[PDB]
Design a protein around this ligand. Structure first.
Ligand code: S1F
Length: 167
């Protein structure tokens, strides 16, 4: 049993809710919140910008030190950093950004990072300002992630479309 509430069950291991991931993280304090990161960990907008704003820019400060030491992530890759006031840990995962021309096949590699964590609160990778089709992202999630994932979808209209079209 865990503290996630109000989710619709899509599969054995994938759950979905119309929710602001910032507000959900603040209430649940999950072990892992996933950030929709880019390779530079520049958290300017979308989910990343919202998560970073909620940390009062501490996420960005930590991320800048990470990049200065380690260099950029790979598209499809991830790193574990602090969850600050939102979670124990933040798993920064880089899905391909279609608005930069990155290969959508890398979306499966991106979701594979979730399998290193037993339970996660996450957005749909490569959705929103990353330009992929969220219905496709949900399909890849369900077909790739085997650990327990709680998906937060900010837009109610999109949430309803994701549920109604789910196979
Ligand atoms: C004040 O609080 C906040 O700013 N919160 C906040 C701000 C932005 C986003 C976001 O860009 N989300 C992504 C988004 C947007 C449109 C379509 C698909 C998706 C996938 C992501 C999701 O559905 O979560 C999420 C939360």
């Amino acid at each position: 049993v865990n503290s996630f509430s109000g989710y619709l069950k899509l599969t054995d291991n994938v759950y979905i809710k119309n929710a602001d991931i910032v507000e959900e993280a603040k209430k649940v304090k999950p072990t892992v919140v996933v950030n929709a990161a880019n390779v530079y960990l520049k958290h300017g907008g979308g989910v990343a910008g919202a998560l970073n704003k909620a940390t009062n820019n501490a996420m960005q400060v930590e991320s800048d030190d990470y990049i200065a030491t380690n260099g950029p992530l790979k598209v499809g890759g991830s790193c574990v950093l602090s969850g600050h006031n939102l979670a124990k840990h933040c798993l920064h995962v880089v899905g391909p950004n279609v608005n930069k021309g990155e290969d959508i096949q890398l979306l499966k590699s991106a979701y594979e990072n979730f399998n290193q964590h037993e339970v996660l609160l996450a957005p749909l990778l490569s959705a929103g300002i990353f330009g992929a089709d969220p219905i496709h992202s949900l399909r890849v999630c369900v077909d790739t992630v085997r650990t327990n994932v709680y998906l937060a979808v900010f837009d109610k209209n999109l949430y309803d479309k994701l549920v109604s079209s789910f196979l």
